[model samples]
Target chain A: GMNGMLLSRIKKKAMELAEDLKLVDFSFGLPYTWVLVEGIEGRALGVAMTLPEEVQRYTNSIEEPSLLEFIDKADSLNIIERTLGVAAINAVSQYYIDLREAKWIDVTELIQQDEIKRIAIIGNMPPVVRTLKEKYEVYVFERNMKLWDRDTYSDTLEYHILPEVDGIIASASCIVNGTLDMILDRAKKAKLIVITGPTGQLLPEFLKGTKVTHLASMKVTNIEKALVKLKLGSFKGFESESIKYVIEV
Target chain B: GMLLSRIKKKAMELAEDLKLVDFSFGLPYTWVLVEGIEGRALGVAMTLPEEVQRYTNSIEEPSLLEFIDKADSLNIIERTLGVAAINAVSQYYIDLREAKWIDVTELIQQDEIKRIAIIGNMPPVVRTLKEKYEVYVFERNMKLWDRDTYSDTLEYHILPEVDGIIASASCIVNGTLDMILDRAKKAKLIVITGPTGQLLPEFLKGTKVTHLASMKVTNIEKALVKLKLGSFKGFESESIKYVIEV
Candidate 1:
């Protein structure tokens, strides 16, 4: 659902910019999978490697698909293809957005008001969760059960809990995993909604009609070096190679 | 596949000892936990946010036998539930056998291990090992990486070079225990430890695993309550007994 909406918008923007742009290169690795477009540049996508054998085989056999084909697979039933499609869309969508206009702001700056009593974080970001936990009632919805702790809730409860919270901070992985639309739909009652993470970088125009208030993401300054670190299953130590920014809608 | 198959066979063997008991799914934030007349156990059932609704609705009041059958299911959630059920039943067998227990730290010292690779970043274990040996922490989560840590992708390189290997029992659920065992040919000691390590010795008869360290649930009610809260905080001496098979 969300996958189709994001892809169609990304495809529309890419079409208006240029007609024959191709997906040049890619890597399917842990933590983040990435794609490089002919003109748009490179962007990271969150990866979910748990798939059935047949689906895994199909994804494993994939070479470089066309831009349109890749974007369409964002809504595919197979998670791997869907992940690649989302990455491709993000890579292409980067050209339409102006990252230089974005301001450097901490996520906590937006949630400092006393009216925001309870907050829900879709992903277990340790630093943000630790900071928010000290002040407000924080509910962290993590998909991976292994990461669950005293304050963490399963992602299943998001439907039941999101509406009651005052603010929401969600990871961009929701875009790749096809849950952002559901989160937005259920979080209408929330006062402020912020999307942040490596994969959270998207065209701010896409959030015009949604409840999203701000988009916090990173820009890859050195695509070559970033790609090497991503293949190693981390973006650590590569912080100097990228710039983190926040765009207000 | 080999690990699940072994668990299923063991479940069938212990079917007589197991009685159909009530079970819970999507328990707060914890696991797809199953309980039997003899013991209780849990396993990690990772669900996607979008599929959570459908995943929860699919399994309804599953019997231990049903879970054994579902262990081979293509669905990851169902498969994990089946593995939890098998682990629940395995607790019964472990009690009947009354196996000996040893601390993992003692094994590392007695075995004279110089270098070790830990598959998961268990904080206490990592901290303890770092003080004595050359410790390398391998994790799939990049956020947890540090100077002493390496990505799990480098396990093939690190596992073969280490003198000792300590891995999380999650490797069994995720279908990588076989590969981890195969790659540990050079290691003198191999220890599989966690709540999910409630595995039978017969299942690992010929494997390179030198020891199985797991918590035996002595107080099922307290353990179930703690598990439902998704935290294993006070389960140490209050609800369970820590045991290791050598």
Candidate 2:
């Protein structure tokens, strides 16, 4: 649902990687866009993408834009470019998933420990945060402050408080706004630092030595079926079977 | 889902029952229209056809009436109404259900009985009743630790001993209202309460239902707008609750 943010960040990083190896075909899929790189000996990756802000107010730009043209505008700041960018990120995620073979450790299990004192959970996961607050000091930050709950606030204090926290659970959305790098820079003090969300599709090498300790991303088993549900405005049971975890190796 | 069935059945039986004095969508609630006694409906929201088709389709009894009957089929009503009409119908029904404004204050002050069986999750009502009576709330989806409630697993025989039974209007939609009443026949007060609570006493004329407690939409337009936006709590803030007894 919040595809725009994650894939946008992935686009620039991916574009840098694409310059190394030619991305042959770019196709859009529900929940992701596929960017098939010629050099990658693996599968095409499906990246998360959404309508760009500029084209949010739409006039249905060209019913049939050339695939080459769409690919050309992959890193541009436009609607089609966003779609192309997501495809590239999916490619990046797939490449990364293959690079490292680390099982993802749940933040809940880590937090349940008697030692996980103060936590800075980026993005408002109310259900998770609600439970965490009972035994630990859980400060949640959502990009849109409107959804802030009883113990959460807007993300203004991350720099001020992130360095002082015990752990940081950065939402995969930090990828969308080009803020994940900054988040990692400030979260050096966090004992358990993780980038988490459906958009956490980064290679461990990309984040291995960084403060990010783990990457938790969705890996839909049935892309075609998941795409249909996404079109129906629901991806309800899509994640039950699809989960990928990669610890920083 | 059963509510859809009951309402659709009622719509069919009603189309055959009405002379069609007037049928118009209420001004504020764009999704809601009155069948006119001229102006009433039974949870009829999700509409695709415009005024012409709505009017035309109204007279075509079987076509509009096959809601639950055709829920499985690939039909127009299934597309428009099935997806999101329940929210509109539930609220609108509460908005127009009925209120001659006669207050029944005695019931709210814990019934004369010592123990009662509540078949619905009326938290506020239960809280007040629990202060005085040995309230045994039997939630069909009852969670053990959440409330001192028992699952219907225990209701088959336990309901007969309770002094009164307050069933949710949801029981009809739940397809359990009649079965519940069948068990609580010995109870002195068999009350039905909810947004979809039966509107008039005549609705319970020959039934075991003694009281119908429900709400009237004080602000239909604002209520409908809130409903469209999926604001159930907000709708309640704009509704006026009343109790009707036979």
Candidate 3:
């Protein structure tokens, strides 16, 4: 239900800014799915491709839908459709960011606040987790069983542990999977809540007045080259094609 | 939603225990008054937005079960009566358990609270709370608004910022309790109180509510006389106040 509200707010803002936008191109690769809008130069990505089992069944039927159609799918029960919806949201968010020329700081710089001694990472971002674990007490909640490690716990523990933590770094996939509301509910005690990963929306209007303090995402700098890298089934060379950005609330 | 379901389930169990299989109950007045095997109980009377007064008046006095089923009715008056039935049965349940009564004002005074939000205007509670804590009263009816009172529409913004919330149990009948609880997630203390606050404490489990303060009628004959007159004046002598802490 919170996800529905989030999508509605994003959709409302997107329509307010530009009601005629259409999807120009799309790709569903092994790691992620990317959608490009006609007016937006950069390609927007979603995590639906990473959740293979839930979306593999729909690969054969994948087709490019209009921007509005994809945005509506964000509320669908189908995982693949929801992914396309998230991609559409990201595309619109990218457009909004460019129009305002929003400034972005690195996410790591903000988490260094002295009060945040314990941190909960909703999804395992190995790089961020590895760095954060060195300084603060880190707890990672990963849904993928194979990703479990010494610091990893079942995502079910989120309700029990999130309320006890000082900070939270939730994956944008939470927005796509409809768990963002539950996460926000449990994170009421958390002083710093950050939504990260490329699938996260950069719209500050969506996060205003909530617990979320920042958003860390990526922007595709080279649309043609990024599309090439996306189709190849990896973000191995995404550093040059995309730039990581953060929006502090 | 869970709170309502839990209360409905418990109301059914209580109805079964009392063997209230027929429509032998008290009269409906400004409040939905019902007679259990033991004593009299009442729920908050609702003022319907539409002209559903005739619609509600036309129905024959319903059985206890039928009354409880109206908690989900589209008609606001019927829903109010249904919730009232729940409260009435709930009083019977609490009496059966022989719950201990406590002064909620004293308990609240002892808490480490700095800010408190009163969802409904309880004159006594507000007068006592404002002396020590920063109190914000949110009333649904603008007519009840004073210099310090906020509209119920502002609850979403104000509830999260407060340390404690004291809301009327009548919110259950009006269907705003769930939203109140959602916004009060960050609040350290939540008290659902009033004459209508007679639901079982078990129904409030996992919720933000720390206490439920309700009134139980001890003198059924006099309470019925007072209800028929459409006034709770001097009803305190006939009822006892009790609080359930979770």
Candidate 4:
């Protein structure tokens, strides 16, 4: 008949996409899986205190920006260095990995300081070997390392940090199965390793040989309660209201 | 003041949970993932199609006896699975999954013999790995493959097959891409992928691994028309339409 029919069709598709987004619950509310995790009764706390300038400017709106920014904020060395062993024990990094899918990739954001910083990860990458250049270094132990790009390039460059590696980012409150105490002791003395991120909360003590840090998280109390008590009104769960709660340890 | 404040807090906590529940878009949508090639058929009725009720019944308000009430008319159901009908059910299923009132037990109905002879679309059926795979549809088509109850409308245009794909496509994460690709690989057929509903000759021009899609002229015409524009820019009309062999 008229374009009305076509318009209806488009509306239907939009509704469908909306449905998919809702199902994942990544954008909307808490996911069913989150409910299953102990201690995390409500939604996992997520907020980007600061977004990478490039992302804010380049893409006007995208989910990755917030996710990345949230992780970026958690990139503190002090909180993580103490908790590495136990942090790696729990699947926090895997949780983030499972939460997102990368539609495109460029080698630029993957680079951090000195060694081609491999800590932060996004979506899956192709198995092809990536060139890090001699100036950049990546840590890959015997077990996790795999040989790729056998045909094209002779050198192995793409690195996969051992899932077992801990306190590389966050500290472990307790290490049951395996402890990196040996590595931590040596690294702490040399200050070769720096651990940081939201997961770094597990360890509250000193870093033996490494510096431990955490992504500054929640304003001490659930923001809504904090606000109500502080007369700032109120809001939602977890995100609290507390001005002096911001302490740099 | 303390006692009054505690009551208020309780009210707010209740409100939060209630709001979450209300917003839960619980609906069983299609489980077709990006690469689900093989699709399971109902082998039962459109609703209770005998096989479903004969095995077991749904809840109280809905019963097998009521389904029998419409059997004759049900059997006569246009024999044509209209695009309209599919879209409606697709919407319902999607809503169910979102609500989280998912009936984890049922996704695709099954028989004692392991044959999927029944279907009672519980809300959470969409959560399973089974349903979301790539599924190729074949309605009661007389010309294409020769099925018993092929509708004239469907037979003339192969509308049943198309409608099924489109309806399920509405509930998919990224449409039928994964299913089509998976199916193509399994069947040793070329995979066809596309992003529009318009007819195109260029798409139908040659037999690729995937079978066919809209003609180029019609495809372009549809794209030119704003009515076919997708929601988030590239959601619709984003890519060339295709049909694969698998």
Ranking by TM-score: 3, 1, 2, 4
DockQ of candidate 2 compared with the true complex: 0.01
Q: Interface RMSD values for the candidates, listed in order?
A: 15.4, 25.8, 20.1, 28.3
DockQ for each model: 0.02, 0.01, 0.01, 0.01
Give the lowest summed-lDDT range of ten residues in model 3 chain B. B19-28
Docking class of 4: incorrect
- Please give the range of 10 consecutive residues that has the lowest summed lDDT in model 4 chain B: B17-26
Candidate 2 stretches greater than 4 Å from native: A1-42, A49-87, A112-114, B1-246
CA shift of B42, model 4, Å: 27
Q: For residues B1-246, write the lDDT of model 3, one tens digit per residue.
A: 335656677677677644333222223333555565565555544343421323343246566676776675545566666676777676666643545577666767545778888998777888887888888887655446555565453465567778888888767766678768887856888888877676767777888888888777777668767766655665556788887776
* A87: Cα error in model 1, Å: 1.0
Q: Write model 1 residue lDDT over A110-137, tens digit each, in one string.
A: 6784379889999888989989999999
**Model 4 misplacement above 4 A:** A1-114, A117-249, B1-107, B112-246
Per-model TM-score versus the true fold: 0.48, 0.40, 0.49, 0.19
**How much of the true A–B contact set does each candidate keep?**
0.00, 0.00, 0.00, 0.00
Candidate 1, residue A175: the lDDT equals 69
The DockQ-derived docking category for candidate 3 is incorrect
TM-score of chain B of 4: 0.18
RMSD of each: 16.9, 22.7, 17.7, 27.5
Q: What are the clash counts of all predictions, listed in order?
A: 0, 6, 0, 83
